[PDB]
Write a protein that holds these residues in place. Sequence first.
Motif: not given
Lengths: 238, 238
Positions: B124-125, B127-128, B132-133, B136, B139-140, B153, B156-157, B160, B163-164
């Motif tokens: 779940m960690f 997947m969520g 996603p992060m 993103q 993408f950017f 943007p 920001r990612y 994050e 951090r992950l």
Amino acid sequence: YFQSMTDLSAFPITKKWPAAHPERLQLYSLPTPNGVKVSIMLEETGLPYEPHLVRFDTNDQLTPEFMSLNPNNKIPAIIDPNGPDGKPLPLFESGAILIYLADKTGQLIPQDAAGRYEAIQWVMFQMGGIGPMFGQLGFFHKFAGKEYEDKRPRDRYVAESKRLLGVLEQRLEGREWILGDQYSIADIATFPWVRNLIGFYEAGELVAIQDFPNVQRALAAFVARPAVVRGLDSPKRG
Amino acid sequence: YFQSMTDLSAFPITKKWPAAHPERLQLYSLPTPNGVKVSIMLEETGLPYEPHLVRFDTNDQLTPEFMSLNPNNKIPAIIDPNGPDGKPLPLFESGAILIYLADKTGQLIPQDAAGRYEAIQWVMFQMGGIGPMFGQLGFFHKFAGKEYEDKRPRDRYVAESKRLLGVLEQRLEGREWILGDQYSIADIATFPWVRNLIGFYEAGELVAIQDFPNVQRALAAFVARPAVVRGLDSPKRG
């Protein structure tokens, strides 16, 4: 000679949020969409719990005490003192907690095997798609300051949020709830995010929520459930 | 008088990707990070499967045939002809498929109850959070054109994603794999995304991957596994 009253002192989080009721599942949360998934599930199933407010204004989620339970520094997290195999169970990730709670007391997940996997599938769709994408729209629409003058990121997440709402809309056609007749953890995972998107995030005009009548039907039913109303206000802001 | 050879014609997806081997789990995928989670899992467990390439260049994932299996229009998706309760099981969401496959043959998930929930938590960690992060950021950094002149943007990612990575780094301290000694679906979910972040997405300088030595250790071990190498190239690009 006999059992001691429940002690959870092995978990460092309890230094910051001591258990007044250590015989109850401990919930460390805030009433944001991911947090209320869990408090709603607890209220629906009637499982006793002791809520603890993890305040963002004081950076509680960044403390070593909180992080000892969830090293990702995010709410919600739980400790069930009476977990599987007769031991306390620490757990984070709202979607994981929903599956755990459904299993623990055999509620709000289909009891047939294929149905279980279908439930997990829709919880995963919520965890990987709905939460992250609605959340990014919320950031770029509501929270991002004037320094983000470029609205291209916002528009990207509007388009994706509309796409995701369309998936939910088509799924709900001819169904009461995401899995059909039976309300489940899939609904509990998903509708708090729909609620937030068109409520707190003020994104209902951007996504044109009225274009998704099945979603509107199910959302209205969801928010009216008494257990949902209780869960949305737990932990108490004071 | 006797069983017919497996027929999956009840599933409209098979009009577009017919089953040459209908007795095998059918995989409809592309070798992106979410897709390779599933092909890697299949290669690790040795379960037979029939891969089908869902091409993005021809918008295959947007066809009614694909969408009849996954209404979210995303890879991967499966149909296991020999599913629970003796019926075919359609399933989408990579994380859900990982749990299903682990359960089906009792591999790559802990067999004790608490360990199962811990595995689901780390999936779940991933997947969520991770998918996603990191996505993103990809993408950017890599895909967004010159019209996105604002790098806020992206930044920001980056923050994050760092951090992950730090969460993973701390978790892997003193552990072989995410759950400890035993390689699991948590690793299979996570390391394809770490790989993509620093490979295809070219974001390794932005996140400074060298700052996460445990992650680098586990990633290097992961990519060298022969089943991982096979899964990363399945379905075949031609």
